[PDB]
Design a protein around this ligand. Structure first.
Ligand SMILES: [Mg+2]
Length: 155
RNA sequence: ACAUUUAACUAAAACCCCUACGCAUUUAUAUAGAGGAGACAAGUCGUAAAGUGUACUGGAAAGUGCACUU
């Protein structure tokens, strides 16, 4: 598929890279993604002001996180909402305010994750650990998975 | 570590120590694998309000947010 150059780099970004974001983890824990080459904007007949990147996806035999897609999407989006802050500041929004501090601590403890890691520094295996612990919590709290902190901020 | 013997009616003889250097140290070569630069590719190729920086971007051919310039 052809994407915009920035989107192609983000889909094909490594850990720590300036383009590491939600798309990187989401595409890379399910597919082997390679950004093959970029086409400049002058090569398109109505010339855009952007470049274009061509990216190849191959589904992985063994996905790097064996969890439901929507659970992984929630975990990744909450991790990457504050991309330049410590990871725990993003994870704490997954839980209600009342249990925010305690549950985040339980999560990081059971996941063996350093709280000081920035989102751009988290590998797919860290996300695997966090997602497995989060699914266990959601099994042990049926109303957790449907929590949206913005709605509880509306009230 | 190691030690002054003989000899001396002219004067001479004798002399000989034991201890490594290595999975240490310096540089270089060969090898798996990965990554860059060069030739604007030449054509019997095709055709006729704006700007700058920075931050996020998962409905990104660019957008929005902040600050600036004419
Ligand atoms: Mg947008």
């Amino acid at each position: 598929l052809t994407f915009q150059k920035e989107v192609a780099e983000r889909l094909a970004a490594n850990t720590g890279s300036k383009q590491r974001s939600r798309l990187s983890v989401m595409a890379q824990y399910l597919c082997n993604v390679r950004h093959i080459f970029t086409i400049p904007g002058q090569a398109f007949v109505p010339k855009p002001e952007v470049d274009v990147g061509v990216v190849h996806f191959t589904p992985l035999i063994q996905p790097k996180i064996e969890q439901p897609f929507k659970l992984v999407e929630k975990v990744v989006q909450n991790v990457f909402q504050f991309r330049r802050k410590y990871c725990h500041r993003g994870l704490r929004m997954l839980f209600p305010e009342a249990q925010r501090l305690e549950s985040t601590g339980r999560l990081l403890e059971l996941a063996d994750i350093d709280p000081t890691l920035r989102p751009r520094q988290l590998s797919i295996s860290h996300f695997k650990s966090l997602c497995d612990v989060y699914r266990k919590m959601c099994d042990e709290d049926p109303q957790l998975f449907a929590y949206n902190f913005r709605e509880e901020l509306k009230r």
